[PDB]
Design a protein around this ligand. Structure first.
Ligand SMILES: CN1CCN(c2ccc(C#N)cc2)CC1
Length: 211
C-alpha cells in the first residue's frame, strides 16, 4: 500500500476495491488530507467522484465560496470543490468521466485530458479527447472559467458551471426541472427539456488504463 495516496487510483492499488469514502493526500502530503468518494467499479475504478446528483435533496444554487470549497454529503449529493479539483488535476495528467442515468437508460463521456486551473484563472476548465455515448457536450464549455451567481448564466439558470452563453452541460442545475435549460442537462444526450435523474463527474490519472 502507499501511505499517502494522492487520488483514488493510488488508494485502489492499495488493494481497496469497494466504492466509498477514502482519505487521499494532495501531492502525497500527509498535511493535505482530503476525504473523497472513490468509485472503484466503473471502467476499472480508481475514480474520485467530484459531483453526484441522484435525488434533489441538496441545493446546488450556491455561491463562489461554496463552489471553491465544496459542499454536501459525499455518500449522497455533493460537490468536491474547485480548489480541490485544481490541486488534484495539477498532480499529473487526469481524465474526466461522466456517468449519466435516467429512467433506466445510461450513457457516459470520457475526456482523456481534464484539468481545472487555480483561482487566478477563475478555475478555467480544460477538457479534450472525447469518447463515449452521451455525446460531446463538454466541448462547448472547453477553456471557460467557472461562474456562480455572485462571480449571468448561473443567475439565469439558478445553477453553477463553466458557463459560456450559456450551456450544453448543466449538471449542477435544478433537480427534476424539465423547463428549457433549467435542469440537470446533458444536451447531446437528452436535450434542454429533460432533467437527468442521476449524474456523476469523476477523475483519475489518464494513464490508469495501462499502468
Ligand atoms: C462547509 N463545508 C461543508 C462540507 N463541504 C464538503 C466538501 C467536499 C465534499 C466532497 N467530496 C463534500 C462536502 C466543505 C465545506
Amino acid at each position: 500500500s502507499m501511505p499517502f495516496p494522492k487520488d483514488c487510483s493510488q488508494a485502489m492499488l492499495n488493494g481497496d476495491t469497494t466504492s466509498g469514502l477514502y482519505t487521499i493526500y494532495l501531492n502525497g502530503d500527509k498535511a493535505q488530507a482530503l476525504e473523497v468518494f472513490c468509485d472503484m467499479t466503473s471502467d476499472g475504478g480508481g475514480w474520485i467522484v467530484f459531483l453526484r446528483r441522484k435525488n434533489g435533496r441538496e441545493n446546488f444554487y450556491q455561491n463562489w465560496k461554496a463552489y471553491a470549497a465544496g459542499f454536501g454529503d459525499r455518500r449522497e449529493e455533493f460537490w468536491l470543490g474547485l480548489d480541490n479539483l485544481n490541486k488534484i488535476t495539477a498532480q499529473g495528467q487526469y481524465e474526466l468521466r461522466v456517468d449519466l442515468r435516467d429512467h433506466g437508460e445510461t450513457a457516459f463521456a470520457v475526456y482523456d485530458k481534464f484539468s481545472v486551473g487555480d483561482a487566478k484563472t477563475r478555475y478555467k476548465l480544460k477538457v479534450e479527447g472525447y469518447s463515449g455515448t452521451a455525446g460531446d457536450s463538454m466541448a462547448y464549455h472547453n477553456g471557460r472559467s467557472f461562474s456562480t451567481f455572485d462571480k449571468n448564466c448561473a443567475l439565469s439558470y439558478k445553477g453553477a458551471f463553466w458557463y459560456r452563453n450559456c450551456h450544453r452541460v448543466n449538471l449542477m442545475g435544478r433537480y427534476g426541472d424539465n423547463n428549457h435549460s433549467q435542469g440537470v442537462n446533458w444536451f447531446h444526450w437528452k436535450g434542454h427539456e429533460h432533467s437527468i435523474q442521476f449524474a456523476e463527474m469523476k477523475l483519475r490519472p489518464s494513464n490508469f488504463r495501462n499502468l
